[PDB]
């Protein structure tokens, strides 16, 4: 055959369809994981500055990162992590969080390695693991209005997934799609098993600043003994509400990072210069206002908490049952009552109910959500088929349009 | 061990010690493959427009490319290639030419496949082949002031490199580092063998617009039968003198391109939105002014041809022997007369003479060039140890500074 066998089984990607259904019909798109309002002024101005400043910013910068950006990443996150971070040895700038993940898997995962993934998971973890020759091993959070915090990571289950073949565990907190914010106890559980079995924790923290109800983001790399076995990933797009900038980073110790640098230099070599300058300027702004009321990292999550609360109240009007998230852009609603009363929606054989339900909801109610079964291993999709994911990081006008659709549903319902 | 075996042997980067040595001395940097003058106003303006326009340009665009960009790529290059190009199936936007190359190797090259590489080669072709499990197979152009045109691709030698395991051949024209522009006859030779053995031609055309002395860029995908077995790669950075934008593309038939799409959706998923908009607007400008005196693609090569001629004359004053390039940012000079008169330069074991010479030249003469042995397979570096690469796409002030260094050259010797 023409194509490499590393591509086996990872050519199906359901997002192309999801994005297609999302725009053409007179619909309210609560499926897209990006804001439909502008980034903050200081961020847009930072990018404007980068493309209207030193003309040499139009040319290549340093391979492992624009130095003003690695400098402030190392400064600011070293403070948050309680860690001294070397910008040249412990920081790599990437093409988004997505590229950061890809770089980590290609650096570390080899044929026959096991990778522990926690369900529900951001869907790329599985095919990225597979492309690198890894064997995904799944542990399912146990469902306990419900709260994301009560979805339990069972210690005996998680412990039994660790083997001599375990290379890495992928921890996503705050979690997409569930909105769970991992507690110190849960991180200590993961940390102890990673230390016991000599496993690297790849930790996806792109939603770090999106935490609600006084819950604290805790980075596992800040725990005792974890810096030397953790990679910590962030995203400028989720941090500054500018998802189209596609700038990300990995933080971690040199002995691991050198292998991500090897992947980087043999794949993209440089990231764009001017978006990196914009991101550096943006972090410098937030660092100087850190913990103050006028800082974006205080204002924004407080705003989005109000949007979350609005959506939670509104979706209940139609009998959807939200699970209250403690963080992220997202919440999920249980649709088990609809599956019970309306089981026979059209769909393919072995098509999970939530995919069928979303198609029905888009066409007939004018609302877009994402079926949560895409965030499960295929064998578990039949058992976790009754949730859908909504995004509440939306303009007030959009949430008003959501309420118009919901009011029309209710009278029908 | 911790890291994946695919990284074996590809962490060494020979550029680093020269750029490190470069920054320490008061030097004229003719090693940098980028302009030290601004991109053209219309290109810089286009990026300014994109970051100060529709605020939704700050959010994600479509996975396989910003649609106004894939539209103009497909229109503009379809005409040049004599091919109907569909934006959705035949175009992929990538993170530079680098990212495009990476995507092609990861899609097509598998354990045990052979990949034919033409020496001197842009240096990533080898480690990218290796990381995808392929086996590089090398064919050397034979050196014929000399002209890059006289470096011959021997028909018998080339034909003998093809085997049942040949997956692809990598064609770079115009060539970095040599500046050779492949003739129709040379491309018909490569096409004939690729059709005979069923081999994909990966064709790196990033220097397409940089052609001199009446020489024409010919795209191999335009030859009979070749569109269905060719991938054509371009770079906005080499096209609009904006290397820090890091936007590239691949063009090709769906039956191959679908596999690059699979790699893309499992590695970066999106390219940045606003640089893509800038590139699209820049191409629209050139399309409207195609073949007209005020067009960049007319003006810029003519201007850089004068810079080339200036550099050729200047470097000769010191006993360097230039080979006149027909295209690209680069020219090479033979340093054989220096190896005869000064054979015993300091260096490590088996360190090729040209690498030692460049270090000597940086430290004693204040000029930076790149040793051409980095563009050769290791077994061939001893034979091909007497060329260095200069970049003449430079500000008039940089060329003045070069001439000042050349005046001060003889005093030592
Ligand atoms: C957990 C997680 N990690 C990483 C990423 C990627 O971040 P970036 O945009 O920086 O590449 C994302 C982006 N999510 O957007 C897709 C969705 O609607 O589910 C993410 O959610
Ligand atoms: C042949 C070739 N292909 C691809 C690329 C990559 O293009 P991009 O910047 O678009 O990723 C380059 C960039 N070369 O600059 C490095 C050097 O001085 O040798 C290139 O020369």
Burial (Cβ within 10 Å: 0-12, 13-18, ≥19) of residue B64: buried
Q: Is the dihedral of CA B24, B28, B33, B35 positive or negative?
A: positive
Q: Which atom of ligand 1 is nearest to the CA of A246?
A: 10
Q: Among B14, B30, B39, B97, name the best residue to mutate to test ligand 2's pocket (greatest count of ligand atoms within 8 A of Cβ).
A: B97
Within 8 A of B62 by CB-CB distance, chain A residues are 19
Q: Does A267 touch chain B (CB under 8 A)?
A: yes
What's B234's DSSP letter?
A: E
Q: Which atom of ligand 2 is nearest to the CA of B235?
A: 10
Measured in degrees and rounded to the nearest 5, phi and psi for residue B104 equal: -65, -50
- The CA-atom distances, in angstroms, between B30 and each of A55, A77, B387 are 19, 37, 14
In angstroms, the CA B370 to CA B30 distance is 8
In angstroms, the CA A107 to CA B316 distance is 46
- The CA-atom distances, in angstroms, between B205 and each of A89, A325, B31, B171 are 34, 49, 21, 8
In angstroms, the CA A369 to CA A121 distance is 17
For residue B374, the tally of other CB atoms under 10 A from its CB is 20
Following CA atoms A200, A206, A207, A209 in sequence, which dihedral angle do they give, to the nearest 10 degrees?
A: 100
Domain limit, last residue, from B262, B292, B322: B292
Instruction: Name beta bridge partners: B117.
Output: B138, B170
Total domain count for chain B? 2
Q: Where are the alpha helices (DSSP H) in A171-270?
A: 184-197, 236-239, 254-265
A55 contact partners, CB below 8 Å, separation of at least 6 = B37, B38, B39, B44
In angstroms, the CA A103 to CA A257 distance is 10
Q: Where are the alpha helices (DSSP H) in A82-207?
A: 87-90, 96-108, 125-131, 155-161, 184-197
B342 contact partners, CB below 8 Å, separation of at least 6 = B413
Measured in degrees and rounded to the nearest 5, phi and psi for residue A107 equal: -75, -35
Is A214 found in the same domain as A81? Answer: yes
Is A33 found in the same domain as A45? Answer: no
Q: In what side-by-side order are the strands of the sheet with B321-323? A: B321-323, B330-334, B387-391, B370-371
Determination method here? X-ray
Is B178 found in the same domain as B260? Answer: yes
Domain limit, last residue, from A257, A292, A327: A292
What's B96's DSSP letter?
A: H
Which ligand is nearest to the Cα of residue A22, counting in written order?
A: 1
Q: Is the peptide bond before B177 cis (omega within 30 degrees of 0)?
A: yes
B399 contact partners, CB below 8 Å, separation of at least 6 = B307, B310, B311, B314, B392
**DSSP string across A162-188:** --TTEEEEEEESSPTTT-----HHHHH
In angstroms, the CA A77 to CA A283 distance is 10
Is A158 found in the same domain as A264? Answer: yes
CATH code assigned at A203:
3.40.640.10
Nearest to A103 by CA among B125, B114, B136, B131: B131
Asked if B390 and B302 count as a contact pair (C-beta separation under 8 A), the reply is no
Residue B388: helix, strand or coil by DSSP? strand
Element containing residue B81 per DSSP (H, E): helix B67-81
CA A190 to chain centre: 19
Is B210 found in the same domain as B84? Answer: yes
Within 8 A of B63 by CB-CB distance, chain A residues are 15-16
- The CA-atom distances, in angstroms, between B394 and each of A210, B209, B323, B369, B391 are 47, 16, 18, 13, 7
Is B137 found in the same domain as B235? Answer: yes
Asked if B358 and B371 count as a contact pair (C-beta separation under 8 A), the reply is yes
Residue B6 annotated as part of some ligand binding site = no
**From the candidates A4, A43, A88, A263, which should be mutated to test the interface with B, based on the most B CB atoms within 10 A?**
A4
Element containing residue A283 per DSSP (H, E): helix A273-288
Residue B176 annotated as part of some ligand binding site = yes
Is A102 found in the same domain as A212? Answer: yes
Nearest to A129 by CA among B4, B176, B383: B4
B364 contact partners, CB below 8 Å, separation of at least 6 = B412
Question: Are A262 and B47 an interchain contact pair (Cβ–Cβ within 8 Å)?
Answer: no
Q: How many residues does chain A have?
A: 413
- The CA-atom distances, in angstroms, between B173 and each of B100, B120, B389, B398 are 16, 12, 16, 27
In angstroms, the CA B391 to CA B311 distance is 9
Residue A147: helix, strand or coil by DSSP? strand
Question: Are B10 and A262 an interchain contact pair (Cβ–Cβ within 8 Å)?
Answer: yes
- The CA-atom distances, in angstroms, between B361 and each of B25, B28, B92, B364, B388 are 11, 11, 42, 5, 11
Is B277 found in the same domain as B133? Answer: yes
**DSSP string across B104-168:** HHHHH--TT-EEEEEES--TTHHHHHHHTT-EEEEEE-B----BGGGSB--HHHHHHH--TTEEE
Share in percent of chain A as helix, strand, coil (round to 5) = 45, 15, 40
B7, B36, B58 member nearest A242 (Cβ) = B58
Instruction: Name beta bridge partners: B401.
Output: none
Within 8 A of A107 by CB-CB distance, chain B residues are 3-4, 7
Owning domain of residue B29: 1-40+293-413
Nearest to B169 by CA among B87, B108, B90, B212: B108
Contacts A–B by Cβ distance under 8 A: 209
A81-95 burial: b if 16+ Cβ within 10 Å, else e: bebebebebbbbbbb
Q: Is the peptide bond before B174 cis (omega within 30 degrees of 0)?
A: yes
Residue A158: helix, strand or coil by DSSP? helix
A364 contact partners, CB below 8 Å, separation of at least 6 = none
Asked if A250 and A104 count as a contact pair (C-beta separation under 8 A), the reply is yes
Nearest CA in chain B to A166: B2
Within 8 A of B43 by CB-CB distance, chain A residues are 58
Nearest to A291 by CA among A180, A229, A216: A216
Question: Are B47 and A48 an interchain contact pair (Cβ–Cβ within 8 Å)?
Answer: no
In angstroms, the CA A301 to CA A329 distance is 10
Which residues 7-66 in chain A show a CB within 8 A of chain B?
Answer: 7, 10-11, 13, 15-16, 19, 32, 34-39, 44, 47-48, 51-52, 55-61
Is B108 found in the same domain as B75? Answer: yes
- Nearest-CA residue for ligand 2 atom 14 is B33
Nearest to B123 by CA among B409, B376, B380: B376
Cα A155 to ligand 1 centre (Å): 27
In angstroms, the CA A172 to CA A123 distance is 11
For residue B283, the tally of other CB atoms under 10 A from its CB is 23
- The CA-atom distances, in angstroms, between B122 and each of A24, A205, B125, B177, B204 are 45, 37, 6, 7, 10
In angstroms, the CA A25 to CA B260 distance is 30
Asked if B266 and A102 count as a contact pair (C-beta separation under 8 A), the reply is yes
Provide residues with CB under 6 Å of ligand 1. Answer: A 33, 96-98, 122, 172, 176, 204, 206, 235, 237, 243, 246, 248
Element containing residue A251 per DSSP (H, E): strand A248-251
Is B236 found in the same domain as B174? Answer: yes
Cα A33 to ligand 1 centre (Å): 7
Element containing residue B45 per DSSP (H, E): helix B41-51
Measured in degrees and rounded to the nearest 5, phi and psi for residue A193 equal: -70, -40
CATH code assigned at A395:
3.90.1150.10
Question: Are B48 and A52 an interchain contact pair (Cβ–Cβ within 8 Å)?
Answer: yes
**DSSP string across B290-329:** TTSTT-HHHHHHHHHHHHHHHHHHHHHTTT-EEEBPSBSS
In angstroms, the CA B193 to CA B154 distance is 13
Nearest CA in chain B to A263: B7
In angstroms, the CA A153 to CA A169 distance is 13
Asked if B168 and B109 count as a contact pair (C-beta separation under 8 A), the reply is yes
| Pairing status of strand A367-368 against strand A28-29 | parallel
3-state secondary structure A58-83: HCCCCCCCCHHHHHHHHHHHHHHHCC
| Pairing status of strand B321-323 against strand B330-334 | antiparallel
Which ligand is nearest to the Cα of residue B174, counting in written order?
A: 2
Last residue before each break in chain A (C–N > 2.5 Å): 144
Is B64 found in the same domain as B22? Answer: no
Q: In what side-by-side order are the strands of the sheet with A166-172? A: A91-94, A248-251, A230-235, A200-204, A166-172, A114-119, A135-140
Cα distance from A335 to chain B (closest Cα, Å)?
29
For residue B317, the tally of other CB atoms under 10 A from its CB is 12
Within 8 A of A237 by CB-CB distance, chain B residues are 60
Nearest to B227 by CA among B269, B197, B194, B275: B194
In angstroms, the CA B132 to CA A95 distance is 21
Is B75 found in the same domain as B12? Answer: no
| Pairing status of strand B166-172 against strand A248-251 | unpaired
Nearest to A243 by CA among A5, A29, A39, A27: A39
**DSSP string across A373-410:** GGGS-HHHHTTS-SEEEEE----HHHHHHHHHHHHHHH
Cα B238 to ligand 2 centre (Å): 8
Q: How many residues does chain B have?
A: 413
Domain limit, last residue, from B292, B325, B343: B292
């Amino acid at each position: 055959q023409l194509q490499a066998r590393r591509l086996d089984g990872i050519d199906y990607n359901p997002w192309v369809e999801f994005v297609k259904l999302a725009s053409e019909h007179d619909v309210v798109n609560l499926g897209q994981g990006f804001p439909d309002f502008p980034p903050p002024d200081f961020a847009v101005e930072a990018f404007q500055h980068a493309v209207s400043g030193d003309f040499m910013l139009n040319q290549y910068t340093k391979t492992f990162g624009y130095p003003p950006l690695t400098k402030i990443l190392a400064s600011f996150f070293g403070e948050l992590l309680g860690q001294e971070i070397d910008p040249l040895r412990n920081v790599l700038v990437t093409v988004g969080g997505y590229g950061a993940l890809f770089t980590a898997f290609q650096a570390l995962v080899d044929e026959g390695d096991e990778v522990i993934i926690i369900e529900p998971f951001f869907d790329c973890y599985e095919p990225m693991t597979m492309m690198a020759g890894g064997r995904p091993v799944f542990v399912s959070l146990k469902p306990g209005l419900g709260s994301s915090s009560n979805w339990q990571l069972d210690p005996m289950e998680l412990a039994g997934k660790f083997t001599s073949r375990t290379k890495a565990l992928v921890l996503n907190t705050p979690n997409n799609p569930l909105g769970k914010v991992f507690s110190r106890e849960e991180l200590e559980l993961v940390a102890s098993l990673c230390q016991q079995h000599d496993v690297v924790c790849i930790t996806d923290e792109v939603y770090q600043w999106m935490v609600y109800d006084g819950h604290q983001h805790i980075s596992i790399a800040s725990l005792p003994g974890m810096w030397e076995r953790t990679l910590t990933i962030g995203s400028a797009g989720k941090t500054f509400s500018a998802t189209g900038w596609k700038v990300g980073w990995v933080l971690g110790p040199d002995h691991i990072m050198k292998h991500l640098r090897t992947v980087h230099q043999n794949s993209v070599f440089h990231c764009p210069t001017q978006s990196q300058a914009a991101v550096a300027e943006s972090f410098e702004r937030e660092q100087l206002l850190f913990r103050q009321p006028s800082s974006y990292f205080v204002q924004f999550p407080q705003a989005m908490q109000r949007c979350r609360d609005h959506m939670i109240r509104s979706l209940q009007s139609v009998g959807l049952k939200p699970i209250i998230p403690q963080g992220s852009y997202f919440l999920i609603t249980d649709i088990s009552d609809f599956k019970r009363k309306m089981p026979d929606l059209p769909g393919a054989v072995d098509e999970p109910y939530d995919r069928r339900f979303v198609k029905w909801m888009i066409k007939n109610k004018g609302l877009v959500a994402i079926p949560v079964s895409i965030f499960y291993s295929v064998p578990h999709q039949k058992h976790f088929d009754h949730y859908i994911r909504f995004c509440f990081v939306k303009d007030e006008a959009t949430l008003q349009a959501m309420d118009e659709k919901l009011r029309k549903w209710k009278v029908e319902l």
